[PDB]
Design a protein around this ligand. Sequence first.
Ligand SMILES: [Co+2]
Ligand SMILES: [Co+2]
Ligand SMILES: [Co+2]
Ligand SMILES: [Co+2]
Ligand SMILES: [Co+2]
Ligand SMILES: [Co+2]
Ligand SMILES: [Co+2]
Ligand SMILES: [Co+2]
Ligand SMILES: [Co+2]
Ligand SMILES: [Co+2]
Lengths: 377, 377, 377, 377, 377
Amino acid sequence: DIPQPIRGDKGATVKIPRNIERDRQNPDMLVPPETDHGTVSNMKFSFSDTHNRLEKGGYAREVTVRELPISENLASVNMRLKPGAIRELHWHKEAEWAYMIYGSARVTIVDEKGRSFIDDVGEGDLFYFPSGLPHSIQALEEGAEFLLVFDDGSFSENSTFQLTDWLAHTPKEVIAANFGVTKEEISNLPGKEKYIFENQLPGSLKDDIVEGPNGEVPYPFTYRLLEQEPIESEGGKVYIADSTNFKVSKTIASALVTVEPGAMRELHWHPNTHEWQYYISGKARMTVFASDGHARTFNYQAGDVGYVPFAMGHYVENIGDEPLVFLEIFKDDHYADVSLNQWLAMLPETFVQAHLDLGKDFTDVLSKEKHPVVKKK
Amino acid sequence: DIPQPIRGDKGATVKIPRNIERDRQNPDMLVPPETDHGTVSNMKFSFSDTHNRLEKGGYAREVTVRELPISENLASVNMRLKPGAIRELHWHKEAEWAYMIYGSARVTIVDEKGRSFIDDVGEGDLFYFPSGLPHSIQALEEGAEFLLVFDDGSFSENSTFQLTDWLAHTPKEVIAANFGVTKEEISNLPGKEKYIFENQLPGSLKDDIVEGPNGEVPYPFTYRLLEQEPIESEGGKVYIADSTNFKVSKTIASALVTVEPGAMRELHWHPNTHEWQYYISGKARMTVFASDGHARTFNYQAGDVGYVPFAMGHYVENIGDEPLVFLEIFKDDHYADVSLNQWLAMLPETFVQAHLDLGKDFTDVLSKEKHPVVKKK
Amino acid sequence: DIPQPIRGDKGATVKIPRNIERDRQNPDMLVPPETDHGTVSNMKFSFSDTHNRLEKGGYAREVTVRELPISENLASVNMRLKPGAIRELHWHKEAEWAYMIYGSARVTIVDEKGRSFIDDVGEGDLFYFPSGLPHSIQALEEGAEFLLVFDDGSFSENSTFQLTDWLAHTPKEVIAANFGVTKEEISNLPGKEKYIFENQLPGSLKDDIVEGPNGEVPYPFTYRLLEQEPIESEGGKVYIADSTNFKVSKTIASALVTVEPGAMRELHWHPNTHEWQYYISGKARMTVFASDGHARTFNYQAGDVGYVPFAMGHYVENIGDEPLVFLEIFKDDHYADVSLNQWLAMLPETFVQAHLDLGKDFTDVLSKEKHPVVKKK
Amino acid sequence: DIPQPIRGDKGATVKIPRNIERDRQNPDMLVPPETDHGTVSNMKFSFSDTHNRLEKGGYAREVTVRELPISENLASVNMRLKPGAIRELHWHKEAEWAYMIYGSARVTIVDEKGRSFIDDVGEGDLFYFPSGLPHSIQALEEGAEFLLVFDDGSFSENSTFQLTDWLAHTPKEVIAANFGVTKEEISNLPGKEKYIFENQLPGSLKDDIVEGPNGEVPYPFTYRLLEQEPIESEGGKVYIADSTNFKVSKTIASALVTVEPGAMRELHWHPNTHEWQYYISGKARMTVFASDGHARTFNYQAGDVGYVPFAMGHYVENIGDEPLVFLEIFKDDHYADVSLNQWLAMLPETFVQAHLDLGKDFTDVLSKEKHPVVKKK
Amino acid sequence: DIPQPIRGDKGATVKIPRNIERDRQNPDMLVPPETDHGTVSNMKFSFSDTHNRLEKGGYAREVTVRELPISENLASVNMRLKPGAIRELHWHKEAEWAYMIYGSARVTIVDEKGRSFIDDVGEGDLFYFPSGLPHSIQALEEGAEFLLVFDDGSFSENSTFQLTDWLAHTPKEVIAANFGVTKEEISNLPGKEKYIFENQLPGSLKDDIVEGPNGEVPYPFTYRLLEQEPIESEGGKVYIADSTNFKVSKTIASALVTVEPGAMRELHWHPNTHEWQYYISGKARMTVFASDGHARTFNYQAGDVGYVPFAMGHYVENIGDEPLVFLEIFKDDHYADVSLNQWLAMLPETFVQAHLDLGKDFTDVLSKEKHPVVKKK
Ligand SMILES: [Co+2]
Ligand SMILES: [Co+2]
Ligand SMILES: [Co+2]
Ligand SMILES: [Co+2]
Ligand SMILES: [Co+2]
Ligand SMILES: [Co+2]
Ligand SMILES: [Co+2]
Ligand SMILES: [Co+2]
Ligand SMILES: [Co+2]
Ligand SMILES: [Co+2]
């Protein structure tokens, strides 16, 4: 049927032309909980509402601070590559973190000491490129689609540094003198960037490996997140990757969260930094508690970006009949949360009861072990 | 008698209605030293000039960047609790540092790993809560009055995150699902925050201690400052607590300084960061030397906040007949100063004489040992 | 007696060393009204808490954004001159408005067309100097003390442009070529600025007037504020000067308000801009209403600066037994206010009743005429 | 002859009065490479275009963010001292790094623990003073001329903290009480700063050394850069000093680069931070590649400051017949670059060929060893 | 000969490699007047130090806030066109003012009511294009070279809105629907912008004029500056154009100043706004007096930009043997200045004497008429 912004005796039918589809995707916004209050920034933006850059070989679209101004420290690109297609050799000012949602791809990277790392990634794997280090992505036989996250909200991926672009804007005399070749020998350099371009499939990983007088990199730039043992609680699963296990990932900590229907990521906050979210699949609502009696609830589904400013209280509730699967990203060297449940369980029961005006029947259910995802009884 | 802004042949009597009381509290402002020069920001604000928030169980008032704009990195709350009264369980974005001026109180804190620390503090003790970590304060039988310092000037304590406020702005369905209880069971949750509230006195410390599967915290969140051996020089005493002795205090370094009458905190500066001051008792003047021939003198007494921007030269002189007692606060992992006296004592005497146009009779009195507080002969 | 921050069952006695004199000056800050709520910036500062610059012939002290950061658009100097003493010929980037509180002075100004205006100002008169136009102030037989207001909060009086300072930092060859004289004829130029200097009394005003070829200025730069007919209401008087009557005063609108014991400047706000206040004599309290359930009360007396950000609700109550006299200053081309009383009086009484849940007995007292100052019955 | 802004069919003769000398110093600006494109900030400023402060004993002139706004993190002073002349004892907020271009000088420094270090420096030596630590420079028998670099673009050296200035603006009573002497004994203190002043030559280094109860400094504050073994490639030499070899230099990394005629600093970028440059001798051009098809070429010669924002591609080409010698400065704890040549040499040749549309004849010349300076064949 | 930074006993010879040619251009910077003091921003930049954009038909180079950061409100382009060459139809956010230094050009503009103005401008004429109004410039038989000034310092000429660029980035279906034509009829549209392009000479002005239904523009967009009567004084001429005579020039006031050898633009300041300068021919020095004892002298010659922040004192002295010709530009609706001479001449002579410690022999030379340019006697 047709939803209306009505809650008990409050609200009214909509009398003007409206976007009923979007209203149906945002039931907790058209009709917020009575417990919402006050001004809170927007914490939700869909990749479907962004310009998609189409190239021969795939596409790329972004959610940055220009779409979602609350997220000043983190931005993201949803990138797709056809089989064999190459995201051109390049670098940026920002560090890059990635999750492989679909397919597989080969990455390259050269570090500051001239050492190369080349590796394949599959679904559920991560990669991380430190700031300034040059890299590439090439999709294998199935193609690839993945999420890139960059540690500056102002990022733009029409504005990174491309190999062929650099050369196209360096005097020919200089390129020739740099390499010890003639101007003639470099006459066929492309006159513009490629960005994404089609290419034949690469050979075996084993045959791409390049040996150097500087040795192997000390830590890999890929990580098999789904092959780790998750934190398992009743209604779901949590896989964490930060700089304590994925060693190179110094500026980005991540978690992949799965929430079964009827379950929720429990009430908690982060005492370290802001949370940036991407919703891979499913449907959720989350209330952000902003202090001083301020709270706003948001709805999310596949393709949405979410956000929770530093230290604000939140939960993520599955409100659909399918699994809810989302990433949590933090610009920091480690993941950390404080669980509301565990916090109160570790305090004297009389003290908690004095706060909450509730009795022993509440404090008895408190648990001193942390269960990030909990399921309704 | 009635003081006038007159110094030698300079200045004149006041001919308009005036605040004679305040003028008497500020003799070095109504009549600055001839050596003051140029524009310098205000470095002085009284808690008596702030709004006091009164609650059942005590009060709290603050000096922030909105009162004292030079102090952008540090703000402070003067908080008072009646016996048994509780400063409600809460958290903030800022780290918190505290000094117990009067009475005693019990604190609680839970860290990111779910480990609890509960302890009593008495006069002269400190506590420190890292950013984001939740905590509480409850005054014991004498009540309590203490100074809180927060590591962001923009702090406001009507704007921290309260337990009952968070719950009051979370949908009931969500609270019930989070804990595995019915909406009925949480029906009596307060509909608003408490902030400070009255409560019966707590039992023994020994009986409040809560055991956990995550073990004890690695370092205590309280510190007995007055039980340490002070640096002792002729006219006073200095007790320092930074992250090298009070291990958890990573973002705040402190010193409690006592200056006998006729004595002064010697000429020095800090090569690391800004100094924030609180005057516990007594009366002082301080000249801040701001470079480029700029200097301004300020007066201080009990209840005043003071400040010295990064690297500016200063001293703190007791100008009353009682002990002068004040705190120095630094947003850094350690205390450090450069003493003017010791600096010059460690340089060739001819070199110093060449600078100062003074002879061997001056350089002979220079001391290579540091005496933070010196007494007039 | 000794005031305590106690109101019924709220609050507690002060247990730490305190500023009792300042507490007596701020009773509505030590014990605010219970209707106060939430974070509001400081709206109060005393000239007695500022460094007084003393010179041969008088003094100058200032309240600027460095003292009162809410006041970004307006700054003030309290300046005193002994008989005959001269505030040196100078100019600034800011426009300058002034109120003569004590004595009398001669002012000079030259405009952009090379025309001069020279006039005497006594108690209750104003002057106004448009931005960048050069001027001077010289006290007459009685000396002078006055309040200067500048239309930028970042103002400093140590940093305006002084005549002798300009000449001291111009090459002697250039000064010589500028006036067609030799270097020797200007060798006695002061090597530095004077700022304020002693001098004999000037002669009669009529013998100082300088005629020239560009004619008289079109509008005077002085105004006799107390010689106008004030708005008189039950408990006081209001004298207004803005660009509509004091024609040159384009960037500053002003009002002098007198409030008898037991009276108040009524509840109102300004739809145009911020209010800057100076308290000439008497004792006051004001609550600033900041919207969204935020309000904060402040106390003021002789020598205090006050402030009310744009559109915020306020009243100014006399809480002493002597008349309360203050200036209201606005950076705009006219004075404007909305009176709470007059506003409701101009609406249908039943509409007002539906809002306030009061009856005809309330709406019957509302007045359609504006009475800016009302007296307690 | 007379150069014109003409390149092939583009540009035109200059028809207005012009600066032919400067045009001759900037041939790649009057006539940029065709490969330049788009808006790029200015990356070049000459010390010859700055105000020189002359004192008895030498001079000092600066290039700061007020001259070169792209350089917000780094500023520089070119300072000259006559034999025996002393740069007065002082300190700043910024850390200081220096290179001795001509002559020799003695430095002093006292650290936070009261330990002194006194040492001589000669041509090609460096010194580094951590922020806030007080120091001095005195030229020996040949005099001295050197480059100072400060780690804040906003630096000004008329605004650092001078010993005699501090004392000149401290009340005499306070100075006397600080040292335990009479006001009489300090009567001859200078009434103003000296900054740079003449003085007789110092005695032996051995006789200036001052012994302390706090021991020797753990790491020296001077460094003999030219006595280290340089990285040697075909057309030049690179000497690097960062915090890994010059231990105290925590915030500044440096390299001195020598480029023979016909040679160039190869194409590279820095993945860590911005580059600041000083051209000691010779003549160069450099193209800064700013991403998104933006590139601008600049010319440089002795006395010029240059700059390369974080991660932008660049090279430095000798375009004269003398050696090109320049400093590269980075605000970071280590030097790091990525060499374009080595980057591509460490990747599969087919992959590189696919990017560049070039064959095996290009990829064969790629070198896996880094040669910072390369010479034309 | 070889200039050295030596003035009497102050300064020393330059011991490091140096830019002797630039030093010869800046003698009052290598050896400033002793009356100079303190930190002042750079007020000088050369067009010769900027990247010259070369196109078929001419060139464009710019001085913006990225070159001269003190100039935040005004930027400039030196543009050259060959005979018949066209600066492509375009518009910008900034208003545009121009002075024709060489040759002649045809300009077009269309206003907000759809009315067109087309006119020819020769040497010494101005044009002005209000913000956002579309225009073009086309050189006549001689070619043209001119100075453009834009009322925002952040301007870039690579980033204005070009006709063909707009069409190139609009969907072909939309362009077709916009004009009621087919996609094929617009297939020959340029695929990119032209910016500057060659073209045959236009015909007579009379045959270019386009009549339309909205009528003639009310005020012309060109002005014959050199055909007005200048202010003539002893050593030169001043021609002023602002909104009072050149009616459309609402945001830019201008003056062309000619100063004979041995003459100077007298000591004055502007009470309204900043001054931006361009030096057309000749050689000058100017001291900018910045208040508080700060002043700095700069040298200028043909091709230089200069600046004087709001209200700062200045003069412009011809220091060569040829006439000195420069533009003064102000972002305001009128030109205004206060003359130091005229100012003092309009005050009582004894008041002036008391300030300057000079006698009647000085005040007797003061002139009540403004002479903007004075000649050395
Ligand atoms: Co990338
Ligand atoms: Co979270
Ligand atoms: Co707290
Ligand atoms: Co200190
Ligand atoms: Co004035
Ligand atoms: Co008002
Ligand atoms: Co230094
Ligand atoms: Co480099
Ligand atoms: Co244009
Ligand atoms: Co001028």
